[PDB]
């Protein structure tokens, strides 16, 4: 059971990373912000998708 | 074959023959007409 659990959490994270990339692909006016720790993030402009 | 010689029937066709630019403009329309703005750059 424990090994099943770790398999599930890892697949969850891989899907987190992949989903963030897919939405970088989509549209919008992004902004690439950089955290302290080394981690990057994106923050979109305040606009209504039409 | 043809010479010129209550209310009629021919009237719509006759006044169409007379007038040539049928949008009413000349009337000081007082109301700003929609969807086509008339604006000049100074």
């Amino acid at each position: 059971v424990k090994q099943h659990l770790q398999r599930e959490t890892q697949l969850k994270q891989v899907q987190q990373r992949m989903d963030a990339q897919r939405e970088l692909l989509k549209k919008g006016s992004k902004k690439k912000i950089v955290d302290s720790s080394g981690k990057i993030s994106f923050k979109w402009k305040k606009q209504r998708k039409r | 074959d043809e010479s010129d010689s209550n209310g009629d029937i021919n009237a719509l066709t006759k006044i169409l023959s007379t007038t040539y630019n049928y949008k009413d403009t000349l009337s000081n329309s007082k109301l700003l007409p929609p969807k086509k703005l008339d604006i000049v750059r100074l």
């Binding site: - | 007082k30 109301l31 929609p34 969807k35």
Partner: protein, 49 residues
């Protein structure tokens, strides 16, 4: 009162409306088949209002 008050009375008074855009009458073609003439006319008047 004043002329400018009269023209504002015009402008205030007249009420809003629907314009003829380029897409209103296209379902008329698919409702045209055997319905009688006056019924078509009243659906047209509804589109205009």
């Amino acid at each position: 009162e004043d002329e400018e008050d009269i023209a504002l009375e015009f402008i205030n008074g007249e009420k809003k409306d629907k314009l003829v855009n380029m897409n209103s009458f296209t379902s008329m073609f698919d409702n045209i088949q055997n319905v009688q003439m006056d019924t078509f006319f009243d659906r047209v008047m509804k589109v205009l209002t």
